[PDB]
Structure 1
Amino acid sequence: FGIDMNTDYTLEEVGKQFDVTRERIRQIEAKALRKLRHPSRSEVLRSFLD
């Protein structure tokens, strides 16, 4: 996402930058979202939705 950076990057662009590439990065994302998805964590961001 464009989060405190200019432009946002193709998921492949992100893989080469870590040397462990590809499908690897595509799972870290989903688990990170999954992590921020349920509570302790979910509570705060949830309230921004109307």
Structure 2
Amino acid sequence: FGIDMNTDYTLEEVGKQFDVTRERIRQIEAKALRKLRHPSRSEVLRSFLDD
């Protein structure tokens, strides 16, 4: 997503250095949501969603 550094990436561009998986690395993100959607912990970021 381009956080904390400069070069925006692709899903393959993570795989050059880390791991060349394609749809588990696509499913990383899907449960990256399901562990971080959580709108009572993310209520602080829901005060950002009503911007």
How many equivalent pairs are there? 50
- Matched-pair identity in %: 100
Comparing 39-48 and 1-10, the one that deviates more: 39-48
Task: Mark the runs of 5 or more structure 2 residues left unpaired by the alignment.
Answer: none
The ranges of structure 1 where at least 4 consecutive aligned residues each deviate by more than 6 angstroms after the TM superposition are: none
Task: Mark the runs of 5 or more structure 1 residues left unpaired by the alignment.
Answer: none
Cα distance in 2 for residues equivalent to 1:10 and 1:47: 30
Q: CA RMSD in A?
A: 1.7
| Structure with more of its chain in helix, by fraction | 1
Comparing 17-26 and 1-10, the one that deviates more: 17-26
SS in 2 for 1:25: helix
| TM-score of the two chains, using structure 2 as the length reference | 0.71
Q: Which residue of 2 aligns with 1:30?
A: 30
Change in CA separation of 1:13 and 1:35 when aligned onto 2, cut-off 3 Å:
same
Task: Report Cα offsets for 1:1-50 as digits up to 9, x if no partner.
Answer: 11011121001111232225211111011211222211343212111122
